[PDB]
Amino acid sequence: IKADHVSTYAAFVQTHRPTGEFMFEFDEDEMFYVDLDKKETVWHLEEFGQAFSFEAQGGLANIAILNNNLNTLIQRSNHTQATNDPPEVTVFPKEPVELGQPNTLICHIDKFFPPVLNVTWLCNGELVTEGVAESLFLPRTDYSFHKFHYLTFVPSAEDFYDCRVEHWGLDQPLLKHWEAQ
Amino acid sequence: NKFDTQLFHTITGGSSPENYLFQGRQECYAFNGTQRFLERYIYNREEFVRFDSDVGEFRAVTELGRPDEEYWNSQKDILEEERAVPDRMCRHNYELGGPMTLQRRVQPRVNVSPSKKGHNLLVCHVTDFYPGSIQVRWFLNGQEETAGVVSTNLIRNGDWTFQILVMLEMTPQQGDVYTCQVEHTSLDSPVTVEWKAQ
């Protein structure tokens, strides 16, 4: 559009899986969201939380409003379901890899629709249960989605990792290899 | 110091396994000291109607938008609320959020490594900075190098930090000094880190 900066509330609502999301971003970075169960605003960086606030109801209301709009467009669309757009996946570390030295692996899952998606990390082929975090489902300009999972870890030559992904646009579950190159 | 909020509209008409999805966007753009508002209403990946404040009223993007653009553009009390946003919510939140956003400046960290085995590359890995705008340059015995230079796209870490990688293809002669230099707003002064090619 030619702007210096873009601040956008982005919300979605669907029958499946994660049934609703309400968030706000600054130049593409999620700043806060409304947790629809806890009913509270979560700030992305805590230093944010100590300066600004947002009235959570403003988020629950917009959700209710989007379900009405969902119903109204299931009806008028003639029940059109979208084709399954498959994820493209990259995995990279947060810092220049240094052996024996604590780091964070990032898995960026991109260009997909809809935001119904299973993701797990594997270390030497085994499911990893701790040291693990995840982004919200993030909005995209072309109306597809992206997401980030994180794994904190100690880089080592004796070890490989995979981001393991599952989505209706994939025949098979998708794995991305990464190892101390 | 509370963030400002708009409600989306509630259309009349509420009047692989199955999945339906509804999306909305309420986006504020900020060109040199100004504010443009776009409100978008999307059904599975398909924007079908939109309010652009430049335009000034609703524009059906798709034939599914007709029942909305026509209804809502005879409804001026609603059409004015969309008209006032650029100078209420957009401007409120912009300058409110400023000191931790526009003013947010986190310094890059810089690492330089070879890549001769597996050509002959040198890798300038720049990590943990905000904001995305940055400039990474390569120098050979003081002289800038354009040729043989591949910078990745800008990489978004997802946690309010970016990283970027700029490599240079090279062939060290003898007493050669290669320098990678980084220009970023977080820095009063551009940062440099060297490779001695003895």
Tab-separated table of C-alpha atoms in Angstrom:
chain	number	residue	atom	x	y	z
A	1	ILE	CA	0.000	0.000	0.000
A	2	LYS	CA	3.068	2.296	0.625
A	3	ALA	CA	2.953	2.979	4.381
A	4	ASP	CA	5.642	3.371	7.009
A	5	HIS	CA	3.861	1.059	9.399
A	6	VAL	CA	0.838	-1.231	9.588
A	7	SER	CA	-1.291	-1.911	12.738
A	8	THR	CA	-4.038	-4.409	12.271
A	9	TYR	CA	-6.541	-6.270	14.383
A	10	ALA	CA	-6.924	-9.701	12.793
A	11	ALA	CA	-9.510	-12.167	13.961
A	12	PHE	CA	-10.820	-15.493	12.714
A	13	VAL	CA	-13.472	-18.012	13.543
A	14	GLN	CA	-14.035	-21.523	12.210
A	15	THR	CA	-15.832	-24.743	12.978
A	16	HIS	CA	-12.621	-26.721	13.750
A	17	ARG	CA	-9.691	-27.191	16.010
A	18	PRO	CA	-8.812	-23.613	17.174
A	19	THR	CA	-12.327	-22.201	16.971
A	20	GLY	CA	-11.412	-18.519	17.312
A	21	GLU	CA	-8.512	-16.054	17.525
A	22	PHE	CA	-8.412	-12.381	18.306
A	23	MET	CA	-5.120	-10.520	17.984
A	24	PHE	CA	-3.278	-7.309	17.097
A	25	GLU	CA	0.059	-6.778	15.426
A	26	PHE	CA	2.559	-4.110	14.639
A	27	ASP	CA	4.426	-4.480	11.343
A	28	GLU	CA	3.505	-8.143	11.270
A	29	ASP	CA	4.525	-8.917	14.895
A	30	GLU	CA	1.775	-10.055	17.306
A	31	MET	CA	1.741	-7.542	20.202
A	32	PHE	CA	-1.223	-8.896	22.188
A	33	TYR	CA	-4.201	-11.278	22.057
A	34	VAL	CA	-7.345	-12.107	24.010
A	35	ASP	CA	-7.279	-15.579	25.562
A	36	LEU	CA	-10.830	-16.801	24.880
A	37	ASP	CA	-10.855	-19.322	27.743
A	38	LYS	CA	-9.009	-17.500	30.510
A	39	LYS	CA	-10.904	-14.362	29.276
A	40	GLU	CA	-7.799	-12.196	29.738
A	41	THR	CA	-5.497	-10.156	27.502
A	42	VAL	CA	-2.052	-11.680	27.023
A	43	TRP	CA	0.788	-9.348	26.096
A	44	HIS	CA	3.547	-10.748	23.906
A	45	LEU	CA	6.390	-9.178	25.822
A	46	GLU	CA	5.827	-8.558	29.480
A	47	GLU	CA	7.354	-5.030	29.325
A	48	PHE	CA	4.305	-4.284	27.085
A	49	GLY	CA	1.975	-5.482	29.833
A	50	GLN	CA	3.318	-3.021	32.357
A	51	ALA	CA	2.601	-0.004	30.192
A	52	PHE	CA	-0.499	-0.611	28.014
A	53	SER	CA	-3.776	-2.425	28.516
A	54	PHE	CA	-6.747	-3.665	26.402
A	55	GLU	CA	-10.326	-4.328	27.508
A	56	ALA	CA	-10.697	-8.069	26.894
A	57	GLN	CA	-14.445	-7.965	26.243
A	58	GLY	CA	-13.690	-6.017	23.112
A	59	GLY	CA	-12.251	-9.267	21.849
A	60	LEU	CA	-15.007	-11.661	22.985
A	61	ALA	CA	-17.619	-9.408	21.402
A	62	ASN	CA	-15.817	-9.372	18.018
A	63	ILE	CA	-15.748	-13.193	18.140
A	64	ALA	CA	-19.481	-13.542	18.694
A	65	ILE	CA	-19.869	-11.047	15.833
A	66	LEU	CA	-17.724	-13.166	13.491
A	67	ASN	CA	-19.734	-16.363	14.189
A	68	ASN	CA	-22.885	-14.556	13.054
A	69	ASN	CA	-20.942	-13.548	9.970
A	70	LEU	CA	-19.767	-17.177	9.609
A	71	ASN	CA	-23.299	-18.535	9.703
A	72	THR	CA	-24.440	-15.844	7.281
A	73	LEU	CA	-21.791	-16.799	4.764
A	74	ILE	CA	-22.051	-20.539	5.108
A	75	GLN	CA	-25.675	-19.895	4.082
A	76	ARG	CA	-25.188	-17.471	1.287
A	77	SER	CA	-22.005	-19.035	-0.159
A	78	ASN	CA	-23.972	-22.272	-0.761
A	79	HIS	CA	-21.636	-24.002	1.749
A	80	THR	CA	-18.346	-23.393	-0.049
A	81	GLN	CA	-15.376	-24.985	1.600
A	82	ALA	CA	-11.976	-23.630	0.517
A	83	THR	CA	-9.370	-25.867	-1.101
A	84	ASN	CA	-6.572	-27.050	1.244
A	85	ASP	CA	-3.506	-24.858	0.796
A	86	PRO	CA	-0.420	-26.820	2.022
A	87	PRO	CA	2.333	-25.464	4.360
A	88	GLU	CA	5.855	-24.533	3.235
A	89	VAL	CA	8.298	-25.122	6.171
A	90	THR	CA	11.746	-23.781	7.157
A	91	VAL	CA	13.772	-24.531	10.310
A	92	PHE	CA	16.646	-22.343	11.498
A	93	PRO	CA	18.319	-21.439	14.836
A	94	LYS	CA	17.948	-18.152	16.701
A	95	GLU	CA	21.705	-17.544	17.126
A	96	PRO	CA	24.773	-18.533	15.128
A	97	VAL	CA	25.113	-22.140	16.254
A	98	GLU	CA	27.716	-22.727	18.904
A	99	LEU	CA	28.410	-26.197	20.224
A	100	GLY	CA	27.505	-27.072	23.840
A	101	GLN	CA	26.064	-23.554	24.046
A	102	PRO	CA	22.248	-22.953	24.750
A	103	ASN	CA	20.178	-21.842	21.738
A	104	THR	CA	16.683	-21.859	20.244
A	105	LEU	CA	15.502	-23.683	17.158
A	106	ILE	CA	12.731	-22.075	15.228
A	107	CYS	CA	10.339	-23.760	12.947
A	108	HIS	CA	8.469	-21.452	10.673
A	109	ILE	CA	5.355	-23.035	9.114
A	110	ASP	CA	4.062	-20.785	6.263
A	111	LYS	CA	1.512	-20.053	3.455
A	112	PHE	CA	-1.188	-22.467	4.706
A	113	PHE	CA	-4.981	-22.514	4.956
A	114	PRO	CA	-6.904	-23.328	7.096
A	115	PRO	CA	-5.393	-22.827	10.555
A	116	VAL	CA	-5.894	-26.424	11.551
A	117	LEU	CA	-2.520	-27.895	12.046
A	118	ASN	CA	-0.605	-30.361	14.213
A	119	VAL	CA	3.096	-29.691	14.998
A	120	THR	CA	5.679	-31.535	17.075
A	121	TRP	CA	9.445	-31.524	17.286
A	122	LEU	CA	11.519	-34.670	17.076
A	123	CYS	CA	15.047	-34.993	18.446
A	124	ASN	CA	16.851	-38.017	16.975
A	125	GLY	CA	13.410	-39.265	15.924
A	126	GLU	CA	11.852	-39.018	19.379
A	127	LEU	CA	8.985	-36.764	20.474
A	128	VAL	CA	10.116	-33.911	22.603
A	129	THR	CA	7.904	-33.022	25.576
A	130	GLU	CA	9.583	-29.974	27.172
A	131	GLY	CA	11.595	-26.880	26.123
A	132	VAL	CA	8.902	-26.071	23.619
A	133	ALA	CA	6.727	-23.072	22.775
A	134	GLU	CA	4.459	-21.796	20.004
A	135	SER	CA	3.168	-18.636	18.283
A	136	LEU	CA	-0.519	-17.954	17.646
A	137	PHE	CA	-1.842	-18.597	14.152
A	138	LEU	CA	-0.556	-15.539	12.354
A	139	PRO	CA	-2.493	-13.614	9.637
A	140	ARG	CA	-1.181	-13.122	6.137
A	141	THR	CA	-1.727	-10.545	3.460
A	142	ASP	CA	-3.023	-13.127	0.941
A	143	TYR	CA	-5.371	-14.500	3.651
A	144	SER	CA	-3.368	-17.719	4.238
A	145	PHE	CA	-1.535	-18.171	7.594
A	146	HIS	CA	1.801	-18.706	9.310
A	147	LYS	CA	3.003	-19.939	12.668
A	148	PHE	CA	6.193	-20.480	14.682
A	149	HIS	CA	7.199	-23.282	17.009
A	150	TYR	CA	10.301	-23.012	19.240
A	151	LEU	CA	12.618	-25.524	20.846
A	152	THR	CA	15.312	-24.544	23.415
A	153	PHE	CA	18.322	-26.827	23.084
A	154	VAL	CA	22.044	-27.390	23.369
A	155	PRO	CA	23.563	-27.650	19.818
A	156	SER	CA	25.661	-30.721	19.285
A	157	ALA	CA	27.162	-32.637	16.390
A	158	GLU	CA	25.732	-35.970	17.649
A	159	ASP	CA	22.057	-34.854	17.121
A	160	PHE	CA	19.455	-34.176	14.442
A	161	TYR	CA	16.026	-32.461	14.657
A	162	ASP	CA	12.809	-32.455	12.583
A	163	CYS	CA	9.783	-30.138	12.571
A	164	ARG	CA	6.902	-32.577	12.022
A	165	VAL	CA	3.768	-31.052	10.461
A	166	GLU	CA	0.232	-32.250	9.713
A	167	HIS	CA	-2.339	-30.478	7.576
A	168	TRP	CA	-5.245	-31.439	5.318
A	169	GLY	CA	-3.367	-30.180	2.224
A	170	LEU	CA	-0.626	-32.755	2.787
A	171	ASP	CA	-0.996	-36.406	1.809
A	172	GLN	CA	1.707	-37.431	4.271
A	173	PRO	CA	2.881	-35.789	7.468
A	174	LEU	CA	5.782	-33.440	6.525
A	175	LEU	CA	9.208	-33.498	8.239
A	176	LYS	CA	11.936	-30.885	7.978
A	177	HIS	CA	15.444	-31.955	8.760
A	178	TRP	CA	17.898	-29.698	10.529
A	179	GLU	CA	21.294	-30.558	12.054
A	180	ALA	CA	24.478	-28.730	13.164
A	181	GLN	CA	25.574	-28.098	9.580
B	1	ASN	CA	-3.052	3.986	28.082
B	2	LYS	CA	-5.665	1.481	27.059
B	3	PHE	CA	-5.624	0.412	23.423
B	4	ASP	CA	-8.651	1.402	21.244
B	5	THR	CA	-11.082	-1.054	19.640
B	6	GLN	CA	-13.591	-1.204	16.801
B	7	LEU	CA	-16.451	-3.664	16.504
B	8	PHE	CA	-16.783	-5.400	13.092
B	9	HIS	CA	-20.339	-5.359	11.525
B	10	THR	CA	-22.986	-7.995	11.917
B	11	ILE	CA	-24.354	-8.615	8.471
B	12	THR	CA	-28.071	-9.347	8.017
B	13	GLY	CA	-28.421	-12.916	6.716
B	14	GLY	CA	-28.100	-14.410	10.185
B	15	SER	CA	-31.624	-12.998	9.746
B	16	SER	CA	-10.802	-33.637	4.363
B	17	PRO	CA	-13.619	-32.932	6.934
B	18	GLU	CA	-15.977	-29.867	6.653
B	19	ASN	CA	-14.583	-26.497	7.698
B	20	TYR	CA	-15.847	-22.981	7.304
B	21	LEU	CA	-13.874	-19.864	8.191
B	22	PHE	CA	-14.622	-16.135	8.639
B	23	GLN	CA	-11.856	-13.535	8.883
B	24	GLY	CA	-11.759	-9.835	9.554
B	25	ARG	CA	-9.007	-7.253	9.415
B	26	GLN	CA	-8.983	-3.741	10.749
B	27	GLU	CA	-5.699	-2.292	9.461
B	28	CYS	CA	-4.178	1.157	10.024
B	29	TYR	CA	-1.535	2.468	7.606
B	30	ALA	CA	0.839	5.270	8.556
B	31	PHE	CA	2.436	7.208	5.631
B	32	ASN	CA	4.559	10.302	6.564
B	33	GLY	CA	2.539	11.517	9.551
B	34	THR	CA	-0.887	10.335	8.331
B	35	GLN	CA	-3.482	7.582	8.817
B	36	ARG	CA	-5.405	5.370	6.367
B	37	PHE	CA	-8.053	2.880	7.512
B	38	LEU	CA	-9.047	-0.445	5.859
B	39	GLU	CA	-11.720	-2.718	7.302
B	40	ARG	CA	-11.886	-6.085	5.542
B	41	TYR	CA	-14.440	-8.908	5.678
B	42	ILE	CA	-13.171	-12.307	4.413
B	43	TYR	CA	-14.805	-15.725	3.963
B	44	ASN	CA	-12.319	-18.607	3.713
B	45	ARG	CA	-9.430	-16.692	2.046
B	46	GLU	CA	-11.861	-14.631	-0.068
B	47	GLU	CA	-12.138	-10.907	0.663
B	48	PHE	CA	-15.665	-10.131	-0.485
B	49	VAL	CA	-16.169	-6.655	0.977
B	50	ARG	CA	-13.954	-3.821	2.320
B	51	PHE	CA	-14.162	-0.315	3.700
B	52	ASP	CA	-11.203	1.828	2.526
B	53	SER	CA	-11.096	5.326	4.030
B	54	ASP	CA	-9.443	6.837	0.893
B	55	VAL	CA	-12.404	5.473	-1.086
B	56	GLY	CA	-14.685	6.665	1.753
B	57	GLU	CA	-17.405	3.947	1.644
B	58	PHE	CA	-17.906	0.182	1.175
B	59	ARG	CA	-16.601	-1.609	-1.878
B	60	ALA	CA	-17.776	-5.106	-2.686
B	61	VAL	CA	-14.638	-6.920	-3.785
B	62	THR	CA	-16.696	-9.937	-4.910
B	63	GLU	CA	-20.289	-10.473	-6.052
B	64	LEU	CA	-20.858	-11.850	-2.526
B	65	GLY	CA	-20.302	-8.263	-1.430
B	66	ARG	CA	-23.252	-6.709	-3.300
B	67	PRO	CA	-25.808	-7.353	-0.471
B	68	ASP	CA	-23.457	-5.513	1.885
B	69	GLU	CA	-22.147	-2.558	-0.120
B	70	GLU	CA	-25.712	-1.761	-1.145
B	71	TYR	CA	-27.248	-2.119	2.352
B	72	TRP	CA	-24.593	-0.410	4.363
B	73	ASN	CA	-24.111	2.610	2.055
B	74	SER	CA	-27.673	3.585	2.974
B	75	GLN	CA	-27.000	3.660	6.702
B	76	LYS	CA	-24.862	6.836	7.033
B	77	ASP	CA	-24.641	6.588	10.891
B	78	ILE	CA	-22.542	3.453	10.383
B	79	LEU	CA	-20.777	4.928	7.330
B	80	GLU	CA	-19.611	7.852	9.461
B	81	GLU	CA	-18.179	5.636	12.208
B	82	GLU	CA	-15.943	4.050	9.597
B	83	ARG	CA	-15.123	7.584	8.314
B	84	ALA	CA	-13.881	8.821	11.747
B	85	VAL	CA	-11.556	5.857	12.566
B	86	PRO	CA	-8.366	7.259	10.873
B	87	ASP	CA	-8.306	10.098	13.351
B	88	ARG	CA	-9.623	8.219	16.370
B	89	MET	CA	-8.539	4.568	16.810
B	90	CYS	CA	-5.739	4.594	14.222
B	91	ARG	CA	-4.109	7.724	15.500
B	92	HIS	CA	-4.879	6.920	19.164
B	93	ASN	CA	-3.111	3.542	19.068
B	94	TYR	CA	-0.291	4.645	16.813
B	95	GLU	CA	1.099	7.343	19.062
B	96	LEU	CA	0.040	5.421	22.193
B	97	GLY	CA	2.046	2.372	21.177
B	98	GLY	CA	4.993	4.473	19.852
B	99	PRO	CA	7.676	4.426	22.609
B	100	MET	CA	7.778	0.566	22.667
B	101	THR	CA	7.310	0.182	18.895
B	102	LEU	CA	8.497	2.964	16.572
B	103	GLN	CA	11.002	3.850	19.243
B	104	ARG	CA	11.937	0.180	19.830
B	105	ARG	CA	15.544	-0.362	18.999
B	106	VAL	CA	17.374	-3.568	19.787
B	107	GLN	CA	20.987	-3.922	18.703
B	108	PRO	CA	22.240	-6.422	16.189
B	109	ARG	CA	24.730	-9.097	17.170
B	110	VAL	CA	27.324	-10.003	14.458
B	111	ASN	CA	29.225	-13.181	13.602
B	112	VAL	CA	31.532	-13.980	10.714
B	113	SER	CA	32.529	-17.470	9.551
B	114	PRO	CA	34.103	-19.311	6.571
B	115	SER	CA	32.447	-21.883	4.247
B	116	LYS	CA	35.221	-23.285	1.954
B	117	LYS	CA	34.263	-27.041	2.070
B	118	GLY	CA	31.129	-29.151	1.441
B	119	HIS	CA	33.394	-21.642	-4.630
B	120	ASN	CA	34.522	-20.271	-1.214
B	121	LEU	CA	32.100	-18.226	0.902
B	122	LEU	CA	32.232	-15.903	3.875
B	123	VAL	CA	29.090	-15.578	6.017
B	124	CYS	CA	28.006	-12.415	7.831
B	125	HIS	CA	25.266	-13.633	10.294
B	126	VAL	CA	23.533	-10.735	11.994
B	127	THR	CA	21.168	-11.593	14.842
B	128	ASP	CA	18.658	-10.283	17.381
B	129	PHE	CA	17.802	-6.825	16.160
B	130	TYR	CA	14.756	-4.688	15.788
B	131	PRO	CA	13.490	-3.155	13.595
B	132	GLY	CA	13.734	-5.015	10.278
B	133	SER	CA	15.253	-2.128	8.360
B	134	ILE	CA	19.074	-2.657	8.255
B	135	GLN	CA	22.070	-2.498	5.895
B	136	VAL	CA	24.874	-5.041	5.694
B	137	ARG	CA	27.894	-4.348	3.543
B	138	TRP	CA	31.099	-6.095	2.588
B	139	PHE	CA	34.603	-4.693	2.293
B	140	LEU	CA	37.774	-6.090	0.720
B	141	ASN	CA	41.026	-4.203	1.619
B	142	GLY	CA	38.861	-1.124	2.340
B	143	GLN	CA	36.963	-1.359	-0.973
B	144	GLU	CA	33.203	-2.095	-1.032
B	145	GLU	CA	32.083	-5.266	-2.833
B	146	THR	CA	28.756	-5.572	-4.774
B	147	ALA	CA	29.795	-8.616	-6.797
B	148	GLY	CA	29.398	-12.153	-5.439
B	149	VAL	CA	27.097	-10.986	-2.675
B	150	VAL	CA	24.007	-12.887	-1.590
B	151	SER	CA	21.896	-11.642	1.285
B	152	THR	CA	19.039	-13.850	2.456
B	153	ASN	CA	15.620	-12.423	2.726
B	154	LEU	CA	15.064	-10.690	6.068
B	155	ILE	CA	14.248	-13.419	8.573
B	156	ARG	CA	11.511	-12.857	11.162
B	157	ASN	CA	12.140	-14.676	14.463
B	158	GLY	CA	8.525	-14.343	15.549
B	159	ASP	CA	9.492	-12.865	18.927
B	160	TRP	CA	9.982	-9.271	17.883
B	161	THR	CA	13.543	-9.873	16.543
B	162	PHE	CA	14.933	-10.375	13.035
B	163	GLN	CA	18.080	-11.913	11.655
B	164	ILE	CA	19.760	-11.703	8.297
B	165	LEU	CA	22.673	-13.459	6.495
B	166	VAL	CA	24.936	-11.842	3.889
B	167	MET	CA	27.571	-14.008	2.246
B	168	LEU	CA	30.448	-13.084	-0.039
B	169	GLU	CA	32.228	-15.263	-2.573
B	170	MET	CA	35.987	-14.683	-2.335
B	171	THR	CA	39.562	-15.727	-3.253
B	172	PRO	CA	42.110	-14.402	-0.639
B	173	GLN	CA	45.386	-13.335	-2.306
B	174	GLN	CA	47.871	-12.686	0.541
B	175	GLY	CA	47.508	-9.835	3.108
B	176	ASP	CA	43.744	-9.487	2.563
B	177	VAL	CA	41.322	-7.898	5.017
B	178	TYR	CA	37.636	-8.438	4.609
B	179	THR	CA	35.240	-6.408	6.699
B	180	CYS	CA	31.520	-6.750	7.223
B	181	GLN	CA	29.790	-3.541	8.225
B	182	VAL	CA	26.302	-3.127	9.636
B	183	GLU	CA	24.104	0.030	9.623
B	184	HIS	CA	21.041	0.004	11.894
B	185	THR	CA	18.965	2.712	13.699
B	186	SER	CA	19.598	1.036	17.084
B	187	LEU	CA	23.236	2.146	16.575
B	188	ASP	CA	24.538	5.720	16.814
B	189	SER	CA	27.490	4.203	14.865
B	190	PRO	CA	27.731	1.368	12.213
B	191	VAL	CA	29.366	-1.834	13.637
B	192	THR	CA	32.199	-3.822	11.989
B	193	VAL	CA	33.805	-7.243	12.352
B	194	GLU	CA	36.791	-8.413	10.327
B	195	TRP	CA	38.306	-11.477	8.722
B	196	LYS	CA	42.057	-11.459	8.369
B	197	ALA	CA	43.021	-13.461	5.323
B	198	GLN	CA	46.570	-14.337	6.293
